[PDB]
């Protein structure tokens, strides 16, 4: 996953009860810095870390 990057972000907020965890894309050379949420349906969804709801859910899942 060293060259795995998010080309598109989800535009609407994912309901908090539907999330499991997250990770960041690890290449600094990815065009768009991204966080990857993993949902209860075992899906990986790209989200824009410049949005507040993404920041808040990151803190939530961290605890």
């Amino acid at each position: 996953t060293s060259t795995t990057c998010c080309y598109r972000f989800i535009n609407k907020k994912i309901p908090k009860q539907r999330l499991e965890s997250y990770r960041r894309t690890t290449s600094s050379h990815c065009p768009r810095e991204a966080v990857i949420f993993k949902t209860k349906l075992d899906k990986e969804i790209c989200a824009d870390p410049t949005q507040k709801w993404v920041q808040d859910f990151m803190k939530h899942l961290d605890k």
Partner: protein, 85 residues
């Protein structure tokens, strides 16, 4: 739904030029959908012959482009691109 389904992490091609990773073409398959990268997104447009010999080190100058309704529109910049494996 189309947006969420297509907001999947995707493998990009690397390069030795120190610039951003770029998609090979402008389409990616995930979650049961052949997705199109958003207009403006960076891509490589490789010829059929270049794709045939694409490997884990650069062996051809790869045309840089931008995605536009599913086509990688070349902008004239050339890079030494390669696949990660």
């Amino acid at each position: 739904y189309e947006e969420a389904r297509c907001a999947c992490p995707a493998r990009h091609l690397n390069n030795t030029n120190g610039t951003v990773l770029k998609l090979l073409g402008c389409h990616y398959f995930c979650n049961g959908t052949l997705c199109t990268a958003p207009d403006g997104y960076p891509c490589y447009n490789l010829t059929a012959q270049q794709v045939r010999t694409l490997t884990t080190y650069p062996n051809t100058s790869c045309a840089v482009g931008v995605c536009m309704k599913g086509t990688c529109v070349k902008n004239g910049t050339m890079e030494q691109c390669f696949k990660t494996p």
